[PDB]
Design a protein around this nucleic acid. Structure first.
Ligand SMILES: [Mg+2]
Lengths: 204, 123, 191, 197, 203, 187, 113
RNA sequence: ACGAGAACAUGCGCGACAUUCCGAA
């Protein structure tokens, strides 16, 4: 990482890094719906795009907070192992097992000071911080969309308000503290969109 | 099986008038042994048809006739007598009679077939 | 790009989604697509006097397949072809990244044509026998090489062809070409 | 409060199982990485839902079990049935005996007019194979756990007397369930008395 | 209240059975000869369709009589009828395996035939693999009770099919003396549901 | 569509010989000699065709009607199904005398008059095989005629041999029909 | 491999005029014993299987005596000595390896015809 | 409050049709 920030990674080295990732294989499973057949109809095929990880690959992330928050996140992650993350969790996807530990390898980088800040999460600041945090910035706006997954938000399923967030990897010379925005449109409950900023300082 | 050594001992080579005949004994003709071979063939086909775990009394009577034929063939030619002496077929038919079982008779028939097969192969 | 592609693709079941800059997007019949990709490579070699090379990705999808998935997977194949010498064509998956002359000659003009001509005589076109060849080729066991030899013996086709197929399966970087030719022939004779 | 029961076990292939999905005539669905036969969780979920709908008869219980997207009565799916992967013990057993994981079945179709047999090749999972299946039951309500589990027992019985994929009216897809364990992984609910099959 | 009726029993070979896969179909796991359920279902459906009546100029199996489509299933668009009969693969029984281990049978045989030309009188030889006569197979059938009032009648049809199958072959060339079989039903019980199947019988 | 069953006996008048790959054809289960249904069907078909081509599927229309035809576009189902004739249990008890005997033929050459002896295994005379035949009524009107043809074939098979070298005294048989009943249908 | 080498050496007519009809009896016996071993799940060959392998050895000797092509096949391919090795080691893996060797031998012999 | 929720890659389909282990002594 640091070598990349100092500019000591060549184009061939960048290609080697890109091809050295061994996450897994993305495939598209074709399924069918036979519910209309019993009503004098036809089968309705559809597609689910899945991604299977290699045996020693997976997805990690970093959590920051006090002891109570860390413990509550331990319980939440323990339940999330069996709830699943992603799409068709009830149709056989997203099941995982998680381990929570300390990260010295990452505490070496998170204690580093520098002249630039790098976003580690999809974040956005309020207006007051956005006034002064956008100078000399190099970012990427992502359109966060989707439907509200809730059994009590409304009668039928509806979408939430369109959101725009800075991408992970965006570099700012001012570190802005994001927040948890509301993308609910007059629903029973407030739908939350987390856009707080986890920062990694570095030298360019 | 252990018939390999018996057939090896029983195997000889004949030469005459520039012709080399690889035959175990001078009188060990395929038909002379084949008479008793076909008697045993009838015996074991009857055993196969009966499909009984014990040696039948009628098979025992044909077998006694087989022993009579063994003595007959020993008298007929000294070569067959020496072959029977080397192989001790009489002891095997005796055990087949005594323990009175299909498996023992099948093992003895397989051993005798092994003897004749090794004799043919060494020819 | 904007004028000569229409002339090159003449008489083919192909629609040009875009052609400009240095990129090119074609959608048509799969066999027509591969044939016109080879023709385009030859015409581009002729146009640039050999000073410019292009890489390609060719995907084969059913109708009603998601068009976004089509584009993304063909772009993945093209980016796979843009590695190292980056003068290659990816064919239907990541394990079939060949050279242009390797695909035109060593796969189609050398392996697929003789086998197609031999198996046209077969009553069933050789679909089941080609399936058995694919099954035997996928595995990597010496006894399975013996099974392949027995199958070639029982194929009832030209003996020199059986020897050629056995040699091709023995050699690596020629077994992949053999598998690609077998799969292309299987796709050609199907419903 | 909130509970989740983990039901792990084995699906044993009684007769060759074909779940549709190089160039193979009617190939079976496979794991993209290991290229191992799998039983998609959607297949099991749909087959059990159809069997339970036939038994009861959507009905409310089906909506509690397999979830509903119906307007107004949005029901969460209590059953999360994961994909059944080729068992490791079955993998070792098939590596021994030099047995492939999948077999090719040849079938005819005799025409009703010309009496001409059209051949057809399919692929099945060999009868000796076993699949590790994993199911999570979510206790959204504690009072219906017994009813939900008796419905699951009925569905499992019907499935054991039915097929799982492909054309099972022609002797394909017969399977058996062996329940290795039923243990409450989340919450305080006591699943010791609960049982399936 | 769904009902499934389980009919288990034995198919006893009477003349050498050859179902091609000239080798025969074998279960890959046990390497024993097998009777695919597709073969049994197709032969039963064909015999029942011929006996009940075949529509002239018929081209598809979906044009069979309504009883045949009710029993063995129909796939016509709109009128999709689910098959009530599910005929499973008949596996080489363990009792027959024990009986064949005694007397040392190989579960199978090779039968030698020849074809004699009308003019040249040349007998071209050939070999076909068959299942030995003494072999037996475990047959398992599941009947789906969808309509109550049509259960008994349906079973009658099944009985007729069996009565046609015992007088017919099952696979290979049975006009030349192959595939002749006999059905002996061990039990007919309602495996699923509250249906009363005590009076039902197919032989 | 009615299935009529013809069940009876084939009693050998001479040495019955079917050359199973000189051994004779035997059922592996019972180790008794059998007469394959393919042999009987082929003999009757050949005799009836002679009484009434390269492809062997042309024949005469009655032959294809009775014994079946694989003609391209004219595939005709076989109304005659000839099953394997198994050794009769009554004949087996009568013999219980080996079921099969070996016959020796010197086979002397012409020019050099050098014998080349051979052994052929043939079922002893007086042995009986229970035979079973199925006739399918595809058309009600033709059945009579079909049976007439069948009778003719049977007559020919009684005047001819069955398997082995019949020009030297092998395979001669006799047919004793026990019953002809409509097992399936109302014919 | 070794089977390829021996078949190529005996190729000119293979093994002094060997055909599949000559070998069919040995092939049938070998595959029968192979299926009997396959059905059982044991690391050691059972007693009846050992006796059947002895019978297979004597059948090898009988076929060598009957035919010269079969005799030279047996001599060059070391099949009888391999049977003795399988009997001595009494391991199912060795028997399966011998069966695979015989199958590869037959496959190559058919391939060079 | 996971571009999410519901959705069986499934229904129909005989590896089958014609074939003397025969001529010769
Ligand atoms: Mg470009």
């Amino acid at each position: 990482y640091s070598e990349y920030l100092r500019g000591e990674i060549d184009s061939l080295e960048a290609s080697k890094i890109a091809e050295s990732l061994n996450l897994g294989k993305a495939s598209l499973s074709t399924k069918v719906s036979l519910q209309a057949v019993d009503h004098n109809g036809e089968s309705e095929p559809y597609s689910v795009g899945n991604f299977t990880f290699y045996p020693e690959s997976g997805l990690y992330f970093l959590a920051k907070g006090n002891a109570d928050t860390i413990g509550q996140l331990e319980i939440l992650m323990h339940a999330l192992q069996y709830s699943g993350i992603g799409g068709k969790r009830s149709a056989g996807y997203g099941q995982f097992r998680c381990t929570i530990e300390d990260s010295g390898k990452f505490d070496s980088l998170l204690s580093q000071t520098g002249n630039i800040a790098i976003l580690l999460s999809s974040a956005m600041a309020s207006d007051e911080e956005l006034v002064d945090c956008l100078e000399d910035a190099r970012y990427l706006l992502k359109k966060r969309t989707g439907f509200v997954q809730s059994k009590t938000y409304a009668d039928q399923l509806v979408k939430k308000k369109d959101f725009y967030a800075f991408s992970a990897g965006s570099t700012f010379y001012q570190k802005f503290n994001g927040k948890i925005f509301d993308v609910s449109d007059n629903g029973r409950h407030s739908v939350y969109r987390y856009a707080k900023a986890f920062w990694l300082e570095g030298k360019i | 099986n252990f018939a390999r050594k018996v057939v090896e001992e029983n195997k000889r080579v004949k030469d005459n008038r520039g012709r080399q005949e690889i035959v175990l004994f001078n009188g060990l003709t395929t038909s002379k042994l084949r008479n008793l071979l076909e008697l045993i063939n009838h015996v074991y086909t009857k055993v196969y048809n009966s499909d009984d775990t014990t040696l039948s009394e009628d098979v025992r009577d044909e077998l006694e006739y087989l022993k009579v034929k063994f003595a007959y063939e020993s008298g007929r030619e000294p070569a067959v007598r020496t072959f029977i002496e080397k192989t001790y077929v009489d002891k095997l038919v005796d055990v087949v009679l005594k323990k009175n079982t299909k498996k023992i008779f099948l093992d003895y028939c397989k051993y005798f077939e092994a003897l004749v097969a090794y004799a043919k192969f060494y020819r | 790009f904007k004028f000569e592609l229409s002339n090159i693709l003449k008489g083919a079941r192909i629609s040009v989604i875009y052609s400009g800059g240095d990129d090119l997007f074609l959608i048509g019949a799969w066999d027509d697509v591969i044939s016109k990709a080879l023709v385009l490579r030859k015409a581009f070699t002729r146009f640039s006097a050999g000073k410019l090379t292009f890489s390609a990705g060719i995907g084969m999808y059913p109708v009603k397949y998601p068009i976004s998935k089509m584009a993304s997977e063909t772009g993945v194949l093209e980016d796979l072809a843009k590695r190292g010498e980056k003068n290659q064509v990816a064919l239907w998956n990541d394990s079939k990244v060949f050279g242009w002359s390797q695909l035109e000659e060593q796969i189609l003009k050398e392996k697929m044509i003789p086998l197609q001509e031999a198996l046209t005589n077969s009553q069933e076109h050789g679909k089941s026998f080609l399936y058995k060849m694919l099954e035997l080729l996928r595995n990597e066991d010496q006894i399975n090489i013996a099974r392949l030899a027995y199958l070639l013996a029982r194929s009832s086709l030209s003996e020199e062809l059986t020897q050629s197929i056995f040699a091709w399966s023995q050699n690596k970087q020629q077994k992949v070409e053999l598998i690609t030719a077998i799969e292309y022939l299987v796709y050609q004779i199907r419903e | 409060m909130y509970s989740k029961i983990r039901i792990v076990g084995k699906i044993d292939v009684l007769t060759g199982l074909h779940i549709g999905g190089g160039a193979i005539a009617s190939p079976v669905v496979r794991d993209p990485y290991s290229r191992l036969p799998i039983i998609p969780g959607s297949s099991i979920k749909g087959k059990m839902r159809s069997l339970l709908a036939k038994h009861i008869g959507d009905a409310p219980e089906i909506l509690r079990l397999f979830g509903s997207s119906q307007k107004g009565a949005i029901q969460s799916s209590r059953l999360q049935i994961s994909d059944a992967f080729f068992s490791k013990a079955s993998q070792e057993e098939f590596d021994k005996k030099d047995l492939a994981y999948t077999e090719t079945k040849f079938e005819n179709t005799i025409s009703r007019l010309t009496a001409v047999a059209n051949p057809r090749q399919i692929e099945r999972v060999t009868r000796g194979a076993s699949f590790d299946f994993h199911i999570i039951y979510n206790v959204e309500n504690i009072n219906e756990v017994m009813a939900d589990f008796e419905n699951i027992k009925t569905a499992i019985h019907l499935l054991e007397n039915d097929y799982l994929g492909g054309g099972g009216t022609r002797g394909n897809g017969r399977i058996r369930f062996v329940i290795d364990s039923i243990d409450t992984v989340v919450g305080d609910f006591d699943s010791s008395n609960l049982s399936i099959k």
